[PDB]
Scaffold this active site. Sequence first.
Site, PDB file in Angstrom:
ATOM      1  N   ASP A   1       2.647 -64.398  30.176  1.00  0.00           N
ATOM      2  CA  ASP A   1       3.608 -65.139  30.964  1.00  0.00           C
ATOM      3  C   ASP A   1       4.553 -65.528  30.217  1.00  0.00           C
ATOM      4  OD1 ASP A   1       2.894 -62.243  32.323  1.00  0.00           O
ATOM      5  OD2 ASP A   1       4.830 -62.212  32.967  1.00  0.00           O
TER       6      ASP A   1
ATOM      7  N   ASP B   1       5.411 -62.354  35.868  1.00  0.00           N
ATOM      8  CA  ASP B   1       3.951 -61.996  37.340  1.00  0.00           C
ATOM      9  C   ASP B   1       3.451 -63.059  36.712  1.00  0.00           C
ATOM     10  OD1 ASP B   1       3.652 -60.594  34.622  1.00  0.00           O
ATOM     11  OD2 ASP B   1       1.601 -59.492  36.376  1.00  0.00           O
TER      12      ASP B   1
HETATM   13 CA   LIG Z   1       3.366 -60.385  32.515  1.00  0.00          CA
END
Ligand SMILES: [Ca+2]
Lengths: 291, 295, 303, 304
Positions: free
Chosen positions: D13, D8
Amino acid sequence: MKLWIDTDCGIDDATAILICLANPSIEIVGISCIGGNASLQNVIRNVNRTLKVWGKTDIPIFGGCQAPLVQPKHIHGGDGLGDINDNDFGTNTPNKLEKEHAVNALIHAANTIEDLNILCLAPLTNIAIALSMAPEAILKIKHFYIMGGAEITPYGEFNWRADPEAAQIVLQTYPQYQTTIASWTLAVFNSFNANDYDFFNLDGNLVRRFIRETWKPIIDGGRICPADPLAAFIAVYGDRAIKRAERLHLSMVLEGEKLGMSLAEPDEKGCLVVKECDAELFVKILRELQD
Amino acid sequence: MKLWIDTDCGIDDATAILICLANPSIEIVGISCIGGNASLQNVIRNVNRTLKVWGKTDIPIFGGCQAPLVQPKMEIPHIHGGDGLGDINDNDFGTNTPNKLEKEHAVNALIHAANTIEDLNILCLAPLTNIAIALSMAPEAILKIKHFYIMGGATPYGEFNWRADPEAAQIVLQTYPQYQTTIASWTLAVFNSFNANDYDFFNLDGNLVRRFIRETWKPIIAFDGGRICPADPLAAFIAVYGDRAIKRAERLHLSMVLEGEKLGMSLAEPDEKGCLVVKECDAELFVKILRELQD
Amino acid sequence: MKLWIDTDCGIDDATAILICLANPSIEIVGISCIGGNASLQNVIRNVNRTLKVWGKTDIPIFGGCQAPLVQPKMEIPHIHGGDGLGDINDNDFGTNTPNKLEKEHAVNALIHAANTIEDLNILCLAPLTNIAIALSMAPEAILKIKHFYIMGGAENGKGNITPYGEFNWRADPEAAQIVLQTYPQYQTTIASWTLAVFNSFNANDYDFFNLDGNLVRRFIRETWKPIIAFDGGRICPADPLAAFIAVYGDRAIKRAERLHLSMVLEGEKLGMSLAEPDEKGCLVVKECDAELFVKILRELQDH
Amino acid sequence: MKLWIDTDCGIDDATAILICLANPSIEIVGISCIGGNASLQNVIRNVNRTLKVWGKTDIPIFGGCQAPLVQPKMEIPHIHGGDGLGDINDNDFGTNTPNKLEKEHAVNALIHAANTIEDLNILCLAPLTNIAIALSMAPEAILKIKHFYIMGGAENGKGNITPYGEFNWRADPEAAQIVLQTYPQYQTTIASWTLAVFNSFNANDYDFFNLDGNLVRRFIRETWKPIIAFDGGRICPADPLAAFIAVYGDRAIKRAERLHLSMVLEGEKLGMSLAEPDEKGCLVVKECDAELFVKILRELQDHQ
Ligand SMILES: [Ca+2]
Ligand SMILES: [Ca+2]
Ligand SMILES: [Ca+2]
Ligand SMILES: [Ca+2]
């Protein structure tokens, strides 16, 4: 009546056990546990819950085998007792478990308690092993009352299909004439509509709460199929529990596509297979114990 | 009317499928299978048996998911038999032949159908696992579907389809418009139950379909203590015969209870944009339909 | 090496027990008895004779089960004689003396042994009824056992008592299945009936079954006479090979083959071992070091 | 190592992806997107930004689901900013270019990869919605995957988005339960939130997220600014730790415990991970080689 109980204490087991606790003429001298409806540890837990709810922790609990004899490895919930909350029943207290294996304890009881009867509510693994180690002792037992077998599709049957070798051992070693059978077929023939019968949906006391919440998941397409209670009902109330019955010699199919089903032939030295029960008396017994 | 059917073909599913096959204004464009009453492998076998007994094996059969989204599997052989279709003997029907099964997963096949077949309707006869996965993957495709006809939900004690996968039902109820949803509930099935000793329409012979109906309903009738509770047939009757099948219905907004002691039950709230929840059918027309398909 | 022995002491069982008695690095912790070659009663008497002949009677002996788990006993030709040990006379061996037998059932004794004796191994010479029941009652205890050496089965598919099954596993196939599906096949070594026929000797070409000068030599000569006289002197010495492997580790084995085994529990092949190549199945030995084996068979008969 | 990444892509990330991009023995075969830190559409744009800044736009990007399996969308403060990547300006990075996005749904793409790519591994950086649907549709295909590396949960029971729940597993607890009861837990390594703030750094004493001089340094520095601003300068680098573990194997792991994990699917503890010692359960990392971790973070930002 002195009575030993062998159980895979799931839901209908617990109510069978209560039927025996409630009758003052019955003396429960021991309860052996076997995996089946749930793991052996869960069964021991659930026997403990059932005794603690009734208020008679006076009965020794023995742990048996964990798996069927030969066949490899649910419906009664994740814990085997309808996933009930111990905190709602006050049963979050240590569980009792004797040190002796269920097989050795049963042999010792058969060797020392006269006029011992046995109520078998589970696959027969413990019993078959006991018969293998000391048939002379187990053959002293006065009578066998067994829940299992089927003539209503037979594919609802669990106890003998779960361990067909153990059932065969029992049926070919202990005298069938001293054996009474409460079948899965009987549990469906004497089943009740829970939209028409309320005896498993009461409140007011711990017993009623226990029965109501444990039976909720099993109540199947809204029907009460009281297999183990009917077995206890027959064991405790004898000929008065029985309307129709037939004498049948029984054997297990141990091979082929019908593995785990049973064969039955009319035989007057065979098992007393109950074909119908006194449902009115049965319900009255169920209601009375919830007082 | 173009119809997609999702089923865990046990006994009453099979008769529901036959209702669809018997009405010549219905085009079954595909049948998707989900585990439920029996394993997915048995459901595929049973859909094949039903189509071969009717004599129309031109309908593609797709296999879906093996288990509910999160709940454990709850097969019911005590009611529907070990094979899910009352343990009938294929050698009595000439159905001891290879089973057809398409290569595509039922989820992608449903999405493709909803993208490409205009005025597609769906008849859901099972836990809503396959439908719930299709709506998560491609809501835009599934929402093209003209109408949902669903057997599920309930009050009587033994509803199966939504209790078996309550997360899947909630996904359907919260993603596909409830106004375009018609429900044949377990309450309805219990309300329209027949006693098998007083009605014989599931106990005829003289041809293959009558023998199929009679033998498949044997075990489930015996389990219900001599009573016929035709849950899935009622759903197919409602989907096929429209307002002619419906005597009384209420618009209700539905939702699943996903936690606590009522897990698997539904809430219902009067709402003119909720599901059309059927309360009464034309029982007389229904029995007539049941008999005519056996001619 | 601490070793439990489960036996249906007939002739070749007795020689195997002597092979373990002769090696001073082997501690026999107990010997359990099961019917097979002979009745349980006779197996107990025969284990007694064997220990008395060797001169070490301080090993506890336990009686086990009287019949197979499920299968009937199966009327078989009493090859090892009427008493299961070649019908020897106790007066010829000075074994006309009281027998010893512990009170505990062999199953409970085996469980207690596996719970209290570290690094316990087991040598199984007989139908596996006692071991299967012990595994059913207390699998945790029996799974503590470091290794299973087992005489039984036929990796090829042709055995002695039936064309498909070797006698021990044909006698109680459910018990054999219980062991093979409950105790780790990787921790199990198999001395099959086909290995026994493969390492078969003709007794008229070797003399290690025909000495005297001491009691052990007479015991071997007299007990083995019926088996030698059955098929014109060709001896397939299964149990002695099983002990040979169990006692002398990698030296008994020159070539072997890893096969996952399972029982056929229905049909004519009732009791047959099915073998499928699998590197964590049973170590199925396919030929032994015959030189060391004959050397061992001679050495135990030394003065 | 062939690696699938499900993300996501918010701020941590992206850094986790850079760690994977920077190691030459890692082959990223595809990146699937799920909503979480931001909407699916922003996630796809953010994966594109990350790949463009690193300068390897060669990796296929798949759009996955639009919502959690059944739970409603959380109502949380968007810590990762409005775009899910700290509200950076594309003009500061040259990323005002078309975005790539494959046509196949991420679920079907993952199934296809698991069916055709040998020794496939997956690094899951987000609510497990895409993975749980793939396991529901085709468990036989996903079970071909050699190993799962998962950022989520908190074995000690101390969550972030709730007192009991770590964000990924609380955002879609059913998906997490599906993974945990379908893919062999023994083939699963967990980088938990408990691991995340045990290895938490204070950013005013460490500078490796505050460099300039090239595009990767500017990206990391600008994207992490709001996360740092959040808890007084404490960075809990959950997703980078998951990638660190996935890429550097045993050299990344100081201490771990084998635990069977379960989800709480009802009540106030909804989304919490239960843990019970079990030798066939998940390899739950308890401590990472922090020194090697900082080293890895610096090297990918080096001008060289
Ligand atoms: Ca994440
Ligand atoms: Ca029971
Ligand atoms: Ca159905
Ligand atoms: Ca022997």
